[PDB]
Amino acid sequence: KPRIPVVWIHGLECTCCTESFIRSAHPLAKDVILSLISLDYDDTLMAAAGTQAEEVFEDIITQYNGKYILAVEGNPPLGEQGMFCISSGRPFIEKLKRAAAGASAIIAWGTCASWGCVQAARPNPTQATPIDKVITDKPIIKVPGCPPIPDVMSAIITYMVTFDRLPDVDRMGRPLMFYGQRIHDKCYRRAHFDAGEFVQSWDDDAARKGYCLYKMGCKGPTTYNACSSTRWNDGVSFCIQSGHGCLGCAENGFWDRGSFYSRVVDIPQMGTHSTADTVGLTALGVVAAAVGVHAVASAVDQRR
Amino acid sequence: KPRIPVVWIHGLECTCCTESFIRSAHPLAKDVILSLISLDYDDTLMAAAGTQAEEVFEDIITQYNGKYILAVEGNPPLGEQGMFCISSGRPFIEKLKRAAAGASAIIAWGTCASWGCVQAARPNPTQATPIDKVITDKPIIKVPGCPPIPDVMSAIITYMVTFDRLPDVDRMGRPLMFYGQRIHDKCYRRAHFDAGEFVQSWDDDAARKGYCLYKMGCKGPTTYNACSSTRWNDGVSFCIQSGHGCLGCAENGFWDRGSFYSRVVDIPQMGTHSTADTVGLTALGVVAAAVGVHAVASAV
Amino acid sequence: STQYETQGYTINNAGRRLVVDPITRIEGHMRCEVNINDQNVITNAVSCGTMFRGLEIILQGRDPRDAWAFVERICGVCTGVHALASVYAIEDAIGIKVPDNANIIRNIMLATLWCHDHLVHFYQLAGMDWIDVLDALKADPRKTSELAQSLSSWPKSSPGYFFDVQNRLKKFVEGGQLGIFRNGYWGHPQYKLPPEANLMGFAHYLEALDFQREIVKIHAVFGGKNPHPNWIVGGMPCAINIDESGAVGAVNMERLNLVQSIITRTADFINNVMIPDALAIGQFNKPWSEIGTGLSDKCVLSYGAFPDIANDFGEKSLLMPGGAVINGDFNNVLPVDLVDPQQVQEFVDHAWYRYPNDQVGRHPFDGITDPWYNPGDVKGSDTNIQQLNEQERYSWIKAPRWRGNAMEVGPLARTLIAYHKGDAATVESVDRMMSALNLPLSGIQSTLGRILCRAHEAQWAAGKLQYFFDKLMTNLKNGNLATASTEKWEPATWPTECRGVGFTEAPRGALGHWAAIRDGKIDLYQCVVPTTWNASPRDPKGQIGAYEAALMNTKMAIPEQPLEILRTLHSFDPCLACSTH
Amino acid sequence: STQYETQGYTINNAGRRLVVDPITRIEGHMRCEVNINDQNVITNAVSCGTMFRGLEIILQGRDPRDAWAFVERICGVCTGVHALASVYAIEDAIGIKVPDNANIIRNIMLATLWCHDHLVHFYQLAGMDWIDVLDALKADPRKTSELAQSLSSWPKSSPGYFFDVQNRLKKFVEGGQLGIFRNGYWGHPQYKLPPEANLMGFAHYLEALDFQREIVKIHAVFGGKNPHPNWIVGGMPCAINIDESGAVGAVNMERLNLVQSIITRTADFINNVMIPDALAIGQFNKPWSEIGTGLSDKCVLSYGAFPDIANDFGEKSLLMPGGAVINGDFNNVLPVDLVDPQQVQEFVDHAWYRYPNDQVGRHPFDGITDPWYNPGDVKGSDTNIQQLNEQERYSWIKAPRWRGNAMEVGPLARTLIAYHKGDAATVESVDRMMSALNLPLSGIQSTLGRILCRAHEAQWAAGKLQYFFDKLMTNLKNGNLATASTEKWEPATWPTECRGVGFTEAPRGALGHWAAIRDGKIDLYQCVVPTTWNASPRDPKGQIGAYEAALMNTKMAIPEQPLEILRTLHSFDPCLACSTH
Amino acid sequence: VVSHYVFEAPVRIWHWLTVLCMAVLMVTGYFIGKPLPSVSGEATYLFYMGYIRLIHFSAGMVFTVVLLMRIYWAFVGNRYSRQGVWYEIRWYLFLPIAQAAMFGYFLMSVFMIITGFALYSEHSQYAIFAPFRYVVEFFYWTGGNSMDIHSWHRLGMWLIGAFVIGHVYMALREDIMSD
Ligand code: HEM
Ligand code: SF4
Ligand code: SF4
Ligand code: FCO
Ligand SMILES: [Cl-]
Ligand code: NI
Secondary structure (H helix, E strand, O other): OOOEEEEEEEOEOOOHHHHHHHOOOOOOHHHHHHHHEEEEEEOOOOOOOHHHHHHHHHHHHHHOOOOEEEEEEOEOEOOHHHOOEEEOOEEHHHHHHHHHHOEEEEEEEHHHHHOOOHHHOOOOOOOEOOHHHOOOOOOEEEEOOOOOOHHHHHHHHHHHHHHOOOOOEOOOOOEHHHHOOEHHHOOOOHHHHHHOOEOOOOOOHHHHOOOEOHHHOOOHHHOEOOOOOOOHHHHOEOOOOOOOOOOOOOOOOHHHOOOOOOOOOOOOOOOHHHHHHHHHHHHHHHHHHHOOOOOOOOOOOOOO | OOOEEEEEEEOEOOOHHHHHHHOOOOOOHHHHHHHHEEEEEEOOOOOOOHHHHHHHHHHHHHHOOOOEEEEEEOEOEOOHHHOOEEEOOEEHHHHHHHHHOOEEEEEEEHHHHHOOOHHHOOOOOOOEOOHHHOOOOOOEEEEOOOOOOHHHHHHHHHHHHHHOOOOOEOOOOOEHHHHOOEHHHOOOOHHHHHHOOEOOOOOOHHHHOOOEOHHHOOOHHHOEOOOOOOOEOOOOEOOOOOOOOOOOOOOOOHHHOOOOOOOOOEOHHHOOOOEHHHHHHHHHHHHHHHHHHHHOOOOO | OOEEEEOOEEEEOOOOEEEEOOOOOOEOOEEEEEEEOOOOEEEEEEEEEOEOOOHHHHOOOOOOOOHHHHHHOOOOOOOOHHHHHHHHHHHHHHOOOOOHHHHHHHHHHHHHHHHHHHHHHHHHHOHHHHOOHHHHHHOOHHHHHHHHHHHOOOOEOOHHHHHHHHHHHHHHHHOOOOHHHOOOOOOOOOOOOOHHHHHHHHHHHHHHHHHHHHHOHHHHHHOOOOOOOOOEOOEOOOOEOOOOOOHHHOEOHHHHHHHHHHHHHHHHHHHHHHHHHHHHHHHHOHHHHOOOOHHHHOOEEEOOEEEOOOOOOOOOOEEEOOEEEOOOOOOOOEOOOOOOOOOEEEEOOOOOEOOOOOOOOEOHHHOOOOEOOOOOOOOOOOOOOOOOOOOOOOOOOOEEEEOOEOOEOOHHHHHHHHHHOOOHHHHHHHHHHHHHOOOOHHHHOOHHHHHHHHHHHHHHHHHHHHHHHHHHHHHHHOOOOOOEOOOOOOHHHOOOEEEEEEEEEEOOEEEEEEEEEEOOEEEEEEEEOHHHHHOOOOOOOOOOOHHHHHHOOOEOOOOOOOHHHHHHHHOOOOEHHHHHO | OOEEEEOOEEEEOOOOEEEEOOOOOOEOOEEEEEEEOOOOEEEEEEEEEOEOOOHHHHOOOOOOOOHHHHHHOOOOOOOOHHHHHHHHHHHHHHOOOOOHHHHHHHHHHHHHHHHHHHHHHHHHHOHHHOOOHHHHHHOOHHHHHHHHHHHOOOOEOOHHHHHHHHHHHHHHHHOOOOHHHOOOOOOOOOOOOOHHHHHHHHHHHHHHHHHHHHHOHHHHHHHOOOOOOOOEOOEOOOOEOOOOOOHHHOEOHHHHHHHHHHHHHHHHHHHHHHHHHHHHHHHHOHHHHOOOOHHHHOOEEEOOEEEOOOOOOOOOOEEEOOEEEOOOOOOOOEOOOOOOOOOEEEEOOOOOEOOOOOOOOEOHHHOOOOEOOOOOOOOOOOOOOOOOOOOOOOOOOOEEEEOOEOOEOOHHHHHHHHHHOOOHHHHHHHHHHHHHOOOOHHHHOOHHHHHHHHHHHHHHHHHHHHHHHHHHHHHHHOOOOOOEOOOOOOHHHOOOEEEEEEEEEEOOEEEEEEEEEEOOEEEEEEEEOHHHHHOOOOOOOOOOOHHHHHHOOOEOOOOOOOHHHHHHHHHOOOEHHHHHO | OOOOOOOOOOOOHHHHHHHHHHHHHHHHHHHHHOOOOOOOOOHHHOOHHHHHHHHHHHHHHHHHHHHHHHHHHHOOOOOOOOOOOOOOOOOOOOOOOOOOOHHHHHHHHHHHHHHHHHHHOOOOOOOOOOOHHHHHHHHHHHOOOOHHHHHHHHHHHHHHHHHHHHHHHHHHHHHHOOO
């Protein structure tokens, strides 16, 4: 009958993960909090501040020691003795370590907690390091993405509560359900990528027909998430559907893999129609010069 | 300020199109009826029955002659003097003609009104014929699908009201927006297709990973709709996502194009069954024996 | 004019003849004709189906695995039930047994169809028979608020809310474009709802027409789309993946979450909008518990439905019980058998079909769908029926009879069968419902009875949805994932010659598909649909169908305005394309 | 302990020191410290941002077209505003000029952020300061119903509804797992809502936490996703196709329909749930129109936002007006210039940063983000701050000053600037709002004033949403479709060396991005964020920030329970990751 | 255009090209319809169905252009130009007909081109291919979908195969009989 206690801490973060979690459509963010788990500590939502909030924290990690789930959003800085993120007058990394040692398992929310995200991009001034580099004695589920898909977050939660176990994971620490397949492999525009039909510059004829964004630097070919399948915000849309290439925001160090707008190295591309087209025009051209000498038309289409 | 009058008739139909239209999420079916158009006649929803319903019909087609839109769902039968569908004691085809002549434009809803759908599949007992074979003097927009996607129906409606014009059509009468591209063209499982990754039998390891359904006879490769892009029921799912191949239910005579679970299918002119393979392999073995006869004729 | 007695009724075609063609707020095409006397009482009723497509004919020579797709398109309103009936039958024929989850899913599909179908009927179709739409304009919003709050814990009830609804309708009507309310029956003395209840009703009419669309998302998940979802012989296509690589390609924890949320919302809606409105229509239109009884106190039929033990259509498994009552003896609920040729029969002596001998009845395995339009002396012509000839052939609907008996099927039948069989759940649901209305048990055998049961059934169905979901989840928890059997998917593996029966309860009554296979091809496929039972013409013995029976002895207040007729008819939930196929 | 006067205030660090660390129900990490006297009145306030990531440093040497993506991740609460500020600036630098629709869409994105952000703050963050959650358990549902109905035409108001809400909360609390309400402040004498208003409030808290999710679907359409949508230098990626083949690959009539429906629902919700609750919190907590005034009656600032003429950031175009007021002279609303080095400056003599000379202020184009943590004699250690040393460096937040003046930015600022500029719309919205509360105009310059304005702003934003939509549709009607410019997309076409300013009004206040380009690379990128203004430390002259100012002279009822502190702070809507970046 | 210029070899170099394209077309084409057994895992990095699709399309090009000019030569080199008489030539030639395999072959490959390009150009390349959009409009008038074009196309393959079986005997009948 009692709900399972969850502690939710925040390090260096933009709060996009807590923002995402509450966007959940099924189950409702509301219903998760009132019926599925006992969200016992979360700086972003809780009533208690200051020495009252300090007191809830201590009371919860004490009374449910060994028994509670630790959600972490954002990451700890190591620079300047960890004081790039101060919590209750002390480095954040200390609150993390004390909460971690008392937890049974740890969810690492978003690219921040999983990998490092933006605060950890070149030159990484705060020396932000992911949770798996700081907490090495506990099970950690990495649910990456900047943010992860709300319904995926909630779905992961419901899996854990309903099935009373941790989701299956790849060698990386990511739940297999939503991170087992690349965006590029469930992309609704694959048909175009397969043909060799690409957007070449924004709002061109191609883009208007929803051709492939591969050449606008889409990084779906190397990004494991569920955006092309599950999609964002109650299945409304996702990066690619809305005309922009995948940034790869669920992938380790994606901020540093060149520009968002450039190709993508080492993904095999060979167009069905594009190549055949070139073969046809390349053969026509051979006969064109051999018998005629090229084509100066007059109608150019004629068929009406 | 006044809303545009719409007359909605039904021939031989299953009513899947009127059911679909009301599933619309945006704008709401409700909001379409109360704000966007004046749905002045619809057998399935209206208060008036009998000689009251006859009276509304007559009154609306008279008072708005030349000015109203004619929605047609289902199709007219030609057999048994058209009495396979009786309306007010008279063949349906008469009600259609009399509503058509008074209309400014015609929306042929679903595969029934567009193509013929199920009632018109072999041996076609009622001789169901599509609207465009019976009404030849009016503009007809074909919005096929058994049914068409609810939000597509409504979207087409909103296009016509907001832009005050008929949607642009392929050389077949379908609005270009949603029927300009094939399902196979915007299939989320395309990656698997070209890869060579197919479901072989239902619920197999492949099927669980959501591989291509081509080999389970998916007809998406030859079916113009928007189900892979727009999707069904507030973008929840569609045939392929939910594990079944496209039947091609927006395409002309799709009921008669072989089995649904089959790639290489019934050529209806070749009769009973006889598929491309069947007839080809029949011919192949014919000439294979015609070779046997002239080789046995080598009297050297 | 001729007169004869049948089933305790005196059928008399003398006196003024009234014609209701076309019947509206039903599925498909119906014509109704009656006779009234000096007291404006119906002494003759004529139930004609004015459409036919011929699915039975079309199906022949088709791959049995393609059949569900064809016959699903029998009806778009009861979309999916025919497919279910199909797969059921082909499996019965070949001898295929589906995996548990396949069943649990199929049952979800059906419970969903019940919830949706019943709701849409109650408001969009039947509602206006009882709710005087235009009278809402004379309602006080504050009292409408106070009323709705007294009947229901439903949140949407503010006096401001009913005021906006009223104003929007006032806006709608104000322009002279009544649309669907045009030339309606408003102000008929049989409209008995007070101003405030009319507004409360109409507001619920619109809320329902909004909410209905969400229920079918459950279909969209498993079936792929609604209307007209997808199925397979062997189980279900919608393979389930819960915690392996590529769960994005299957039914997964997120998808199941969607379903779950729709279940909760559907249950909540039915229980707090429809259910209270049903009881409230019962409250104010009370004398209708004695009008339109028809066959319901003589002969009722259920096949049974919702098999909880997978691939077990037996009594100890079907959550919705089967059985038949005849001659008003409800203490002896007889077992129904669909194979038995002396049980389900179809006479066509009054239908537009051709038999070798048209005086005998054919059991569906011997069925003959040979269309032959032939109305006879109709006083008009073949292309102009002014008045059907009920002495001869007069409908596209075949006349089915259980052991020669004329039956009523549907929600009311299901309830009496369930009740008198002793069903713990149903004895508590009916007794409290009738006690709430201060009406006796017999009050349920009526035009009002039919509406009340339908609403009860939606409540039941939505309850059952949650039950089925839970069942599915327990399997998933317990590592049971299989959704399809493929062992006998190949035709090479089917009996060279075989036959089977598919049966369930469609929202409108008892559905059966009889199918025969020969060399991988459909040899025969015959359909006996719920409305075929209810809207049935007469048979050789002159016995009348459920419809014509329920219309008899009904008092009409205004003869040219056939509300009393419409009320009685709609309460059965007519579905003509279903009945004719 | 030392004492000095500043801005009409007497800053005194003698007397008991109170420490509120960590501040909750805000975005990111904040520490607040105060001093109280014998009368329990705040005589000193200390505003410390306890986080830093260093976006300005990271951005250096990246492609300016990649910048929006990096800086969007400054904040996930005000998600998207920083991207907008970015594109604006890179376009200002290169000299880009976007198509009309691109703007209309961007304005939509912002209005959407306003609607959503404000709503979530009013309920999820600030709400509990005013609504005694646990006191709802002592409310009578019938009176709670009667109250809600007196205030609003909102449909969800049945006595049954408030009863379920109460019961669900009673179930929640009954187990000893108060969760987020654990060790809260309930029963504090500053909670002034009656039982019934508390339940009405809490029911709205949940309804809001549900509805909020739907608003962002507008982002999902155009942006692709929310949080953190996508953008491009040159306009917007979300190409539009309405009537031509392949409209399935673009923003089409169906997609626009979705957006439309969200606009309607968002407007309706804000107007009937938030707006009434705001006024109602105003009604019962009335003496708060005189507590927490701060800088709001001395110095306020707006840059301006929502350019209606495309690529025209002038006064005649920005729908949300810009301007600054200093010394309480609101009759002379001064023009703001972001290029001018004698206007926007940033002093770091009290922040953990390093300057060549730390006594001067640097305009953003000369900005230096060199982190240098150095707290000094804090009576504890470097790794254990028991008490910050406000005499020296004490925050990760830079101190920005407009012309040396300490400013307040945000909803209240925007309103006074808009009002005193003569804005026809704003003079009618404020005058009626204050007249409804029987409070004078000056009542708006307060902690309560701040909440009221925010609510008014959401109302405004949702109205403007519909406006922007319509504008976009009129273009589509008129064959105008272009969504992006691509002439200067190539780096080969950019000036070898150039700089630009991006500016708008984020939900919290005035936002500016100053960017410098050299050889297709970011040379410099500096950010001055709304909360950086508000939560600002002191400067060389010892002047205090908007926060520390609003906390001064505030009476505390219980010192160990800092509700009065939280109330004042939350009303500014703190966003610390924004303030620090 | 990616390449330019060759010159031209002897004419039999263009026969061999056909037969090769022909064979390649048939194999690949067969497996478009009845695809090989499914492969497994990580779609990004594999693309089998697509190559047997790509080779087919481009083999088609080389084939079509080789045949268009193979014909262009045949009837300009003929000088026979540049119903009544076709029912009088079959009535004194009944009173060795493998020249009706030249006509059959010719027409079959032409038929294949038309059907195939109706299918290939239907992602409307809009370029020169508009004529082939009548072919689709035809098959709809016929009774049904673009699906039929597949069915009929495939039928062409088998029928073409029949002419090969009828050729390679007729060939190896005289190649063996070398008296
Ligand atoms: C005599 C030479 C040819 C042969 C033997 C051949 C054979 C085939 C076969 C057997 C199919 C499978 C259709 C099915 O079973 O559904 C096919 C498909 C196809 N063929 Fe050909 N064909 C030939 C010529 C051409 C030409 C000249 C083109 C022009 C580009 C072409 C383009 C296509 C296309 C576009 C498809 C459908 C591919 C898909 O579904 O993605 N074919 N061909
Ligand atoms: S847009 Fe990206 S994920 Fe989609 S098909 Fe093109 S390359 Fe693959
Ligand atoms: S399932 Fe059908 S439409 Fe989808 S990729 Fe496979 S063949 Fe194409
Ligand atoms: N319900 C339903 Fe349709 C009917 N009658 C079926 O079966
Ligand atoms: Cl899952
Ligand atoms: Ni922010």
